[PDB]
Amino acid sequence: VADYSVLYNFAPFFAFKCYGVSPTKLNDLCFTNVYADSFVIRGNEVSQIAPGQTGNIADYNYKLPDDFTGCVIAWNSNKLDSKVGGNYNYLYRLFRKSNLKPFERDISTEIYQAGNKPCNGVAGFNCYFPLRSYGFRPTYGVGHQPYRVVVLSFELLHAPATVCGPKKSTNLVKNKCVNFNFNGLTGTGVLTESNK
């Protein structure tokens, strides 16, 4: 059961944008599968994370489907990823030959042979390593400060649905004509203690 009330209790959510479905709706319908995709980007590229968008991250690193279902939750994390002397452990693919199909991974770490002359292990002149590392220094501006992103994607296929938000229960009222809903059994009447 996916309680999204814990979402709002979290960080200010610099960006909290839900596509197609509304935030008040996703706690009602019941999906069959959820994918949570987490990463760290720059503030400048947070707008790049959107269906049908263009940019370095949109093209080569993380491409949303044109009919993406779900939503994106981004929040600043300058408390964590900011380190004095620059935090050089967060990489991103600067060089690529093509555009990724939606929800694809490109972990290949090779020299980008973008010139006529091949490299084959020689990183000289026209021989580039496509993974550039962010600075994420504490003094960087809002655009270049690190921002964490989680994209939630929902699948509601013909398979039985097993992920969706919680259902509330009221008190129990007896010896009074009321309207009851017991696990989906809906009726009206007087509820009494029994010995069945």
Epitope: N76, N78, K79, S82, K83, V84, G85, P138, Q145
Partner: antibody
Framework: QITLKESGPTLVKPTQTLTLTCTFS??????????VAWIRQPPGKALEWLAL???????RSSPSLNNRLTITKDTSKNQVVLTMTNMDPEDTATYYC????????????????????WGQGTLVTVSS | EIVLTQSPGTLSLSPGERATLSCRAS???????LGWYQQKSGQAPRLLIY???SRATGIPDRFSGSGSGTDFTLTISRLEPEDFAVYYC?????????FGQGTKLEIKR
């Protein structure tokens, strides 16, 4: 108020390797923004920081001495081990371990970063 | 590497008046990465000011500091004989983290 203490063999022979124990109390090595810094001070000369370890087991070494310097942390024991090899008589100095923290306010604007008050330190001398 | 420079080498001023020191940087970097530290003879250094523009914890209002780019300065107004200590300016901008060269404050006679 945090207690910082340093220990290790004060007499080490030259071209040898020494290990330094740093014990801290009042804080733990599982908090964001917390680091442990190892600093050497020659007698009468300017201060000179050497090494840093973050809470996430990520360590910074001085580019002038990163070859033979290691700093490791143990959150469970509130323990720090600094191993430094190939000492020479000139390495007769004072060794300190201290805290590193930074300040953020409602947007993580980074109102600077600082060191906490340093420990007692150890006068480590090298002589054959 | 960014080099720092304390000025003057040794400052000689009596307690009571204003004492001012300068710290200049060879290269440029943001203000918040410089820190003013205090240490006594045979004593552990103590954090004087962090960010070089905001007081540290428990610092009396006499201590102050201001500067920009590659030129900062620090000032102590009501200094006592026990307050006479060695002050260092250290950069948090990039590794290695290097302090000042040390300036001694002494009572005039």
């Amino acid at each position: 108020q945090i207690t910082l203490k340093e220990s290790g063999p004060t007499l080490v022979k030259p071209t040898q390797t020494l290990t330094l124990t740093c014990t801290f109390s009042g804080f733990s090595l599982s908090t964001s923004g917390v680091g442990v810094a190892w600093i050497r001070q020659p007698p009468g000369k300017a201060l000179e920081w050497l090494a840093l370890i973050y809470w996430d087991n990520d360590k910074r070494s001085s580019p002038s001495l990163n070859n033979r310097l290691t700093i490791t942390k143990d959150t469970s024991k509130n323990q720090v081990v600094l191993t430094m090899t190939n000492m020479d008589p000139e390495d007769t100095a004072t060794y300190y371990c201290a805290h590193f923290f930074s300040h953020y306010d409602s947007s993580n604007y980074y109102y600077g970063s600082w060191f906490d008050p340093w420990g007692q330190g150890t006068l480590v001398t090298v002589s054959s | 590497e960014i080099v720092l420079t304390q000025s003057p080498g040794t400052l000689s001023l009596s307690p009571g008046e204003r004492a001012t020191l300068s710290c200049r940087a060879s290269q440029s970097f943001d203000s918040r990465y410089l820190g003013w530290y205090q240490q006594k003879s045979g004593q552990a250094p103590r954090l004087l000011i962090y960010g070089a523009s905001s007081r540290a914890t428990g610092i009396p209002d006499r201590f102050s500091g201001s500067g920009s780019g590659t030129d900062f300065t620090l000032t102590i107004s009501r200094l006592e004989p026990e307050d006479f200590a060695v002050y260092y300016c250290q950069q948090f901008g990039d590794s290695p983290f290097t302090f000042g060269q040390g300036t001694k404050l002494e009572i005039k006679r």
